[PDB]
Design a protein around this nucleic acid. Sequence first.
DNA 1: AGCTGAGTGATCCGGAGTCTGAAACA
DNA 2: TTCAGACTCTGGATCACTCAGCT
Length: 361
Amino acid sequence: KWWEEERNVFRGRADSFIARMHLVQGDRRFTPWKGSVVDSVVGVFLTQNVSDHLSSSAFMSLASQFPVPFVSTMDTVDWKAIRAADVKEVAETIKSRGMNHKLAERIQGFLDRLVNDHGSIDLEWLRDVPPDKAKEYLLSFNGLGLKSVECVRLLTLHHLAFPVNTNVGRIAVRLGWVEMYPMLESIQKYLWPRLCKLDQKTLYELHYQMITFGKVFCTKSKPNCNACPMKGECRHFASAFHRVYELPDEHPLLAQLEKREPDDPCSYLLAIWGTILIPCRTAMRGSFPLNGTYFQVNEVFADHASSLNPINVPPRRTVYFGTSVPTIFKGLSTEKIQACFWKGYVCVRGFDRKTRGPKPL
DNA sequence: AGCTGAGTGATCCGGAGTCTGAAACA
DNA sequence: TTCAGACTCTGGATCACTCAGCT
Ligand code: SF4
């Protein structure tokens, strides 16, 4: 059949795209997180039409404002209190993200429906049910579309789905697979049958890589096509033609700091001027929605208390600071970005340990 | 035939950055 | 040197309305 042999052609190219970038884009496979299903639902709720860092910071502020009493799937937010809470404070809590009243009312309605139907607030059983019925039940909610449900299923329930976002569509069109021409998002009906038969781990990995490639090299305006490894196979090419010292685990400075997560590859950093940068997984104790796909491989947080009041006592790694990932990554040299990926760190925001809430940098 | 209707295109609930061009001045 | 909007940002829900559909 012509279909199956045509499946091999792009699947061979897809793994070729993964293999070529994996040399430069670092190494990353499925690393589990302890986030509950409701947490992932609220995360996909908050990441609609907004940049990733703002969406994550909004969820962090939401968690800090209404905390579960603490020091596996466990909710980090007293969702019952939020549902019982008045709309004004909830809207004020996430006002920094935007659409504060709209999203707050949608969240309150979601929680109210969850309480009214199927008893109390729990969605752990969604993992057991067959994927199609879970997808339909998730889509049944208002404020959720196809792409959000696909991302939830792929990242949380480990199904075989692929979110075709603006990053995915542009990359697929330009990179010899399928101008400023506005293309309607229907290439999924084209792309997915090609990718219907593929390894699950393959899909998750391909895309962590693509999200990264979309953000680093193949930006919408002025892509760094000179340093891009896939410039040879790029169809769009034919159309056109501060350093820090890292602190060991048992360093005396981290006595007040909490115990590091055993799974996190990152290590504690020293922000010299005295300030400390906490790794994202350690800062959040894992337990973050969407498998922690918000944060890069080497994304770290900052300590607001140590930033305002320095803890100063009077190997070397490079940290690139900026407002967002795409801004700093615009590099005319490939070697610099490869080094920053394999042996570098990135920080964009700040965080406080006392109230566990995000603070401006 | 004279009423569907399917399907798309604007719009906006909203903050927060960057980017142009205009202006201005030489 | 200002600076005011014009865009983008892992999208959804409403309302209005041009091309097919038909019988
Ligand atoms: S060569 Fe340029 S357009 Fe092609 S994939 Fe690389 S960055 Fe994108």
